[PDB]
Every structure is written in C-alpha cells, then in structure tokens.
Amino acid sequence: TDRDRLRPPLDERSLRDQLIGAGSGWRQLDVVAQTGSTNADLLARAASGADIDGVVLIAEHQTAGRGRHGRGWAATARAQIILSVGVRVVDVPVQAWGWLSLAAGLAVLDSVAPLIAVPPAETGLKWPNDVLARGGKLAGILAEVAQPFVVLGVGLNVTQAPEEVDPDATSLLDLGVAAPDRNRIASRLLRELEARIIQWRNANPQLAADYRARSLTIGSRVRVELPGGQDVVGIARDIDDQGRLCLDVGGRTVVVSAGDVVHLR
Numbered sequence: 698t699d700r701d702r703l704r705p706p707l708d709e710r711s712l713r714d715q716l717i718g719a720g721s722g723w724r725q726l727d728v729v730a731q732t733g734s735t736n737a738d739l740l741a742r743a744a745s746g747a748d749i750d751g752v753v754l755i756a757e758h759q760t761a762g763r764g765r766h767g768r769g770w771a772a773t774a775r776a777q778i779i780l781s782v783g784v785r786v787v788d789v790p791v792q793a794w795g796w797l798s799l800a801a802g803l804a805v806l807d808s809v810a811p812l813i814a815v816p817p818a819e820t821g822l823k824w825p826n827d828v829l830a831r832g833g834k835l836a837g838i839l840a841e842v843a844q845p846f847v848v849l850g851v852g853l854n855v856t857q858a859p860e861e862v863d864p865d866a867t868s869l870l871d872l873g874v875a876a877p878d879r880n881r882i883a884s885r886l887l888r889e890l891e892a893r894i895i896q897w898r899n900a901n902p903q904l905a906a907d908y909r910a911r912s913l914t915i916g917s918r919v920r921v922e923l924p925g926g927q928d929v930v931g932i933a934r935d936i937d938d939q940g941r942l943c944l945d946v947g948g949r950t951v952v953v954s955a956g957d958v959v960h961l962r
C-alpha cells in the first residue's frame with residue numbers, strides 16, 4: 698500500500714519529446730493504461746500490416762504477460778517498466794538474431810546499474826534473458842520472431858515487490874533505490890537499447906565484449922534445464938556467434954540454443 702505512493706504514472710508526452718526526433722531512431726511511442734501483453738500487441742499490429750520497426754509500446758499495467766516457453770509474467774500497475782519495441786531484422790543473417798535478445802538484457806542492465814549505491818554480489822546477466830541483482834530477477838526479456846520483425850519485450854521491476862509477482866524476483870526499490878524515477882529510467886533504457894540494436898545490426902564486436910563483461914553465467918558451474926525436461930550439468934564457458942550457450946561437460950562441448958540456467962556453487 699505504501700509503495701503506491703512511490704508509483705506515479707509515466708509521462709507519455711515527456712518520453713515522446715525525449716525519444717522521438719532528430720538523433721533518435723524511435724518512430725512511435727505509446728503508453729497504455731492496460732493491456733494483456735505488449736509483445737502480443739506489437740505482433741498483432743505487424744500481423745495486420747503495420748511497420749513496427751522502431752515502434753515503442755509501454756504499458757502501465759499488464760494482465761496476461763508472457764514469459765519464455767509458454768510461461769507467464771506477473772505485474773501490478775505502475776510497479777514495472779513494461780515495454781515492447783519492434784525491430785526489423787530481415788537485413789541481418791538469421792544465425793545472428795539470437796544476439797538481439799542478449800543485447801536487450803545488456804541495455805536494461807546498463808540503464809539501471811548506476812542507480813544502486815553499491816552493487817551486491819550476483820548482479821549482471823544470466824543467459825539467455827535475465828537481469829539479476831543480488832541473485833534476484835530484476836528484469837526478464839522476451840524476443841518473438843515475426844519476419845521481417847522481432848518484437849523485443851522487457852519487464853523491469855522498479856518498485857514491484859517479490860510478494861506481488863514471484864519469490865525469486867527483486868526490484869530497484871528492494872535493492873535500496875528509495876525513489877526510482879520510471880520516466881528517467883525508461884528514457885535511459887530506450888537510449889541504451891537503440892545503441893545496442895545498432896551495434897547488433899552492424900555486428901559490432903563491442904556488443905559481445907560488453908555482454909561478456911556483465912555475464913554471471915560464463916565461468917559458472919550451471920545446471921541447464923532443456924526444453925523437453927532434460928537437465929545438463931556443466932561449466933559455462935562462452936556464448937557462440939548465434940547467441941548460444943557453450944558448456945564444458947567433463948571435457949565435452951555442449952551447445953544449448955535455449956534453456957533455463959541455474960547457477961550452482
């Protein structure tokens with residue numbers, strides 16, 4: 698109840714003023730009070746012929762959020778930054794589209810990293826889509842492919858309490874950021890995201906380099922829970938040029954395109 702006082706609404710006009718115009722690649726930005734899924738919404742626009750490249754959709758509340766692999770995403774009003782953007786990807790080799798998702802998490806991380814007084818342990822990126830802080834899930838990323846576009850979705854916990862959404866979640870407020878400004882964070886996030894998308898489109902090596910620098914997974918003992926229910930235990934060593942996780946399994950290399958990572962002691 699007290700957190701409500703820490704959840705003023707977004708300022709759509711201000712965001713537009715900042716993010717659309719010379720020097721910026723964003724073409725459209727809308728804030729909606731409520732929707733089922735911002736990712737579904739942008740996919741639907743594309744499916745009816747809309748050019749969603751550089752289109753931004755932000756929702757104050759999201760009632761039927763989607764996670765990876767048919768899972769859900771929970772939210773309460775004004776507690777998160779919940780957005781999707783459209784990205785034209787057909788100009789880029791299909792084998793590289795996996796990196797777009799990794800780039801998105803990096804952008805989210807960089808957009809909020811400096812708000813924390815001192816970064817707790819286990820703060821960075823968990824492959825393939827998690828921004829972690831103090832071991833808690835601060836943000837989740839969902840990339841959905843609908844050539845010629847990919848729709849990139851971000852759910853970032855700003856003041857969202859774990860008790861409201863998920864026991865393994867955290868938020869900026871729960872990390873000690875007393876009065877996070879969603880307007881400022883949203884603007885920084887989208888600016889970081891534009892830069893990373895440009896880097897990705899041009900195969901800039903700095904993208905992979907910066908991702909590696911923030912990886913909590915690389916070098917860690919991991920259990921990876923594969924689509925279909927199988928588990929593989931090993932040590933994460935690298936991310937390949939397709940954005941796939943490379944594991945060391947007793948001296949053998951196992952490359953995973955999708956899975957849920959658990960960092961082990």
Ligand SMILES: Nc1ncnc2c1ncn2[C@@H]1O[C@H](CNS(=O)(=O)NC(=O)CCCC[C@@H]2SC[C@@H]3NC(=O)N[C@@H]32)[C@@H](O)[C@H]1O
Pocket residue numbers: 733734735736737761762763764765766768769770771772779780781826834835836837838839850851852854857862863865866867
């Ligand atoms: N708020 C939360 N914070 C942290 N963890 C959560 C939350 N809610 C659920 N979980 C857990 O996280 C698991 C899911 N983890 S995944 O790794 O499978 N999937 C994700 O994290 C992608 C989330 C994308 C959400 C963005 S938003 C705007 C856009 N439009 C959409 O509809 N989607 C995107 C769930 O099973 C829960 O256990």
